[PDB]
Amino acid sequence: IKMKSSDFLGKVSLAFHRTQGLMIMKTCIEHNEALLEEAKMMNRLRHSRVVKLLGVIIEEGKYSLVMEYMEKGNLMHVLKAEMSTPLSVKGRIILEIIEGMAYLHGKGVIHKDLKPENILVDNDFHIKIADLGLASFKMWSKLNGTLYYMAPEHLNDVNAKPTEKSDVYSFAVVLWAIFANKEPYENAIAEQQLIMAIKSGNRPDVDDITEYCPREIISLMKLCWEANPEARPTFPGIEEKFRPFYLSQLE
Amino acid sequence: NVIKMKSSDFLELKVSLAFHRTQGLMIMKTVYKGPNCIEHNEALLEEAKMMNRLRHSRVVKLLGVIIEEGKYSLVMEYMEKGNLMHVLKAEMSTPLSVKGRIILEIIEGMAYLHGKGVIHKDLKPENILVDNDFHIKIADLGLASFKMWSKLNNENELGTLYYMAPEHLNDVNAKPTEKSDVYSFAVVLWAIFANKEPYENAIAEQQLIMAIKSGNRPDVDDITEYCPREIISLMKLCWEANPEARPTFPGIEEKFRPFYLSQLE
Ligand SMILES: C[C@H](NC(=O)C1(F)CCN(C(=O)c2cc(-c3cnn(C)c3)ccc2F)CC1)c1c(F)cccc1Cl
Numbered sequence: 001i002k003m004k005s006s007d008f009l010g011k012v013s014l015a016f017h018r019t020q021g022l023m024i025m026k027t028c029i030e031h032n033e034a035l036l037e038e039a040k041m042m043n044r045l046r047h048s049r050v051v052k053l054l055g056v057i058i059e060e061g062k063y064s065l066v067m068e069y070m071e072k073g074n075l076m077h078v079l080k081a082e083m084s085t086p087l088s089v090k091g092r093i094i095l096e097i098i099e100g101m102a103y104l105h106g107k108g109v110i111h112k113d114l115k116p117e118n119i120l121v122d123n124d125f126h127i128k129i130a131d132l133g134l135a136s137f138k139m140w141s142k143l144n145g146t147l148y149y150m151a152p153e154h155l156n157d158v159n160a161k162p163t164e165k166s167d168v169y170s171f172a173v174v175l176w177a178i179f180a181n182k183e184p185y186e187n188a189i190a191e192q193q194l195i196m197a198i199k200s201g202n203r204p205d206v207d208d209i210t211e212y213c214p215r216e217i218i219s220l221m222k223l224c225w226e227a228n229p230e231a232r233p234t235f236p237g238i239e240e241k242f243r244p245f246y247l248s249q250l251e
Numbered sequence: 252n253v254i255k256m257k258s259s260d261f262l263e264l265k266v267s268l269a270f271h272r273t274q275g276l277m278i279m280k281t282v283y284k285g286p287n288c289i290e291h292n293e294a295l296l297e298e299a300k301m302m303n304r305l306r307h308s309r310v311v312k313l314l315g316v317i318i319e320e321g322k323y324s325l326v327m328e329y330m331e332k333g334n335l336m337h338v339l340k341a342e343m344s345t346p347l348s349v350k351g352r353i354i355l356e357i358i359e360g361m362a363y364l365h366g367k368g369v370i371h372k373d374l375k376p377e378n379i380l381v382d383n384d385f386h387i388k389i390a391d392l393g394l395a396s397f398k399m400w401s402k403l404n405n406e407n408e409l410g411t412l413y414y415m416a417p418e419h420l421n422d423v424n425a426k427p428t429e430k431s432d433v434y435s436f437a438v439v440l441w442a443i444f445a446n447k448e449p450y451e452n453a454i455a456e457q458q459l460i461m462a463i464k465s466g467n468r469p470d471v472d473d474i475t476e477y478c479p480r481e482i483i484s485l486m487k488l489c490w491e492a493n494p495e496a497r498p499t500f501p502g503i504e505e506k507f508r509p510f511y512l513s514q515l516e
């Protein structure tokens with residue numbers, strides 16, 4: 001959907017569409033063809049757990065992407081709020097993340113940058129996975145803490161290709177963060193030390209989860225952050241074990 | 252993945268209930284009982300491997316195949332409450348909130364199948380199976396999508412048109428599309444709120460077929476229970492005579508999900 005600036009009244013702003021209401025907007029003639037098709041690739045990913053690109057503004061000197069407004073922000077923001085989020089809601093968040101990831105991998109899409117900033121939350125505490133850094137979109141990205149969720153095989157090795165297992169690693173650390181209510185690795189001394197430590201087997205401190213976290217989720221996070229990518233499960237594999245666990249115990 | 256299971260791993264509803272020695276209770280459809288055809292065994296296996304790729308919480312799983320000498324069977328997961336019509340006709344009544352959730356799950360199931368380039372061809376309440384928590388799974392029990400296994404059935408010792416889009420009635424070279432499945436869905440929605448099959452007052456099959464082809468639909472006034480205005484609009488839109496005028500399942504999901512969340516959940 002090719003939108004115009006005049007339908008509303010870089011940087012992120014909250015915007016009011018004249019016919020369609022409240023959205024979030026992030027703001028060279030040769031690149032316009034490629035940018036449009038690249039946005040058409042973003043729009044083909046349609047699922048309840050995946051954010052929707054509602055459209056794009058290609059004007060002279062303004063290039064913007066417009067997505068749906070997710071009222072409660074990112075996942076870390078919800079987790080760090082004073083109103084605590086009960087075990088049943090955390091479990092459902094996990095299930096929904098699994099569903100969103102299973103959908104993306106089923107379409108041959110590797111996220112590459114799964115992290116709590118990229119898990120957006122609506123007013124009823126439902127989630128959608130997003131690619132807010134534009135990891136999957138070269139031209140739009142070109143036209144424009146961060147490493148805690150990254151699989152060790154990508155740390156100090158920028159040339160190796162991401163796989164589905166890269167996202168499984170990220171998921172693992174998201175699970176830890178969901179129960180810890182914070183970023184991991186608070187007691188690290190420096191980033192290069194940390195990176196090397198992580199590459200050698202260091203992982204978030206399981207004992208730093210104070211609240212009740214069921215044994216199954218702790219087992220799951222450990223399996224999903226295994227050093228060998230081939231030892232990590234797939235998202236279909238995770239869904240089939242986690243769904244019945246969620247239904248019996250958490251729902 | 253698919254398990255090549257053996258008869259000896261198991262200890263009529265031909266559909267039988269079967270107990271696997273290490274894996275418990277399943278349902279078996281024994282497709283062929285007769286003289287040995289070793290040639291088709293490769294094709295039957297791979298065809299079952301291919302349909303085993305359709306994996307989603309809202310579609311049933313093929314757990315295994317039995318490819319033996321003169322015995323060809325398919326094994327699926329057991330769904331404790333049977334089909335949707337059986338749930339709906341039961342005495343212990345099903346609240347609006349559970350019905351709404353059922354509709355959402357059917358939409359999710361169908362959106363997944365369509366997203367894989369599968370057209371069901373025979374969506375109906377007998378193909379909508381129900382677990383003990385009232386969650387649903389779509390199935391293809393008559394083998395509409397399994398060509399070789401369907402061929403094998405009609406070699407050997409061993410449907411309803413109420414859900415069929417009007418364009419396939421009296422059209423023996425019928426070419427189903429995704430919009431054919433959307434029509435079926437529409438009548439499923441009606442049946443979920445009526446608690447019964449439509450067209451009770453139809454007398455003959457030719458009368459009904461011609462009536463439906465001329466624009467007759469399930470009787471909206473014959474829903475006695477509360478059905479929200481929105482769902483009535485949705486069933487009407489989904490059973491539109493022109494297939495191009497029916498929405499897709501993703502289109503349905505986007506309008507139905509937030510309605511479900513605000514009003515029905
Ligand atoms: C299908 C899903 N699609 C997308 O994620 C988007 F289309 C990516 C592009 N988008 C924005 O750039 C965007 C960002 C912002 C924004 C707000 N705050 N900040 C810091 C940034 C605001 C408005 C915006 F339009 C929109 C969402 C997808 C995918 F395509 C590929 C892989 C995984 C996934 Cl999950």
Ligand SMILES: C[C@H](NC(=O)C1(F)CCN(C(=O)c2cc(-c3cnn(C)c3)ccc2F)CC1)c1c(F)cccc1Cl
Binds near residue numbers: 306393
């Ligand atoms: C992914 C899903 N897969 C399937 O639906 C099945 F693999 C179909 C094959 N199956 C049986 O034939 C079967 C039937 C019966 C049976 C019970 N009652 N009756 C009257 C019959 C019992 C045991 C059985 F194994 C198993 C389930 C699918 C698909 F492949 C294609 C299109 C849509 C869909 Cl949804």
